[PDB]
Amino acid sequence: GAMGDSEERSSWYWGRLSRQEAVALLQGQRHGVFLVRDSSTSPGDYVLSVSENSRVSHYIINSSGPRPPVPPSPAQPPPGVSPSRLRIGDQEFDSLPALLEFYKIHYLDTTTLIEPVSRSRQGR
């Protein structure tokens, strides 16, 4: 056995990988493996890459996570305990593991989700 969790980011996270770089290794290895790219341009977003039918699709995930509190009412004191919010493409979730787990067995666009793509660029 070996590592392989959904909550562990160090398990389904590698780093920044361009389109050619991400695909170079994510060239549809297993029946269907997904990989998380380390976005850059974005001020604080995450890019998700999915492999299927020998392809590689990229999806940008938004993470509102508003640090500063903002009351919905015109007159009211700002709270302290506020949960984070994460949205991907045209769907919303609780966190990275929330969508990854809910889609770990369900289709996100035109395919399901399976174990993460090898951490290395070589099949061992």
- Second CATH tier, the architecture: 2-Layer Sandwich
Order of helices and strands: HEEEEEH
The count of DSSP E runs of length 2 or more, i.e. the number of strands, is 5
User: What is the count of DSSP helices, taking H or I runs of 4+ residues?
Assistant: 2
Radius of gyration over alpha carbons?
A: 17 Å
What share of the residues does DSSP label as strand, in percent?
15-25%
Helical content band:
10-25%
Number of domains: 1
Q: Which term fits the overall shape?
A: elongated
Please report the distance between the alpha carbons of the first and last residues: 15 Å
The secondary structure category is: alpha+beta
Name given to the CATH homologous superfamily: SH2 domain
Strand order of the largest sheet: 1-2-3-4-5
Summarize the main sheet: 5 strands, antiparallel
CATH fold-level assignment: SHC Adaptor Protein
Q: At the first level of CATH, what is the class?
A: Alpha Beta
PDB class: signaling protein
Keywords: SH2, signaling protein
Assembly: monomeric
Entry title: SH2 domain of CT10-Regulated Kinase
Output the keywords.
124 residues, alpha+beta, monomer, SH2, signaling protein, SHC Adaptor Protein, 5-stranded antiparallel beta sheet
Describe the structure.
A hairpin with a 2-residue loop joins strand 2 and strand 3. The longest helix is centred in the first third of the chain and has 7 residues. With 124 residues, the chain is α+β, with helices and mostly antiparallel strands. It is built from two helices and five strands. Strands 1-2-3-4-5 form a five-stranded antiparallel sheet, with helices on one face. The protein has a single domain, classed as SHC Adaptor Protein, CATH 3.30.505.
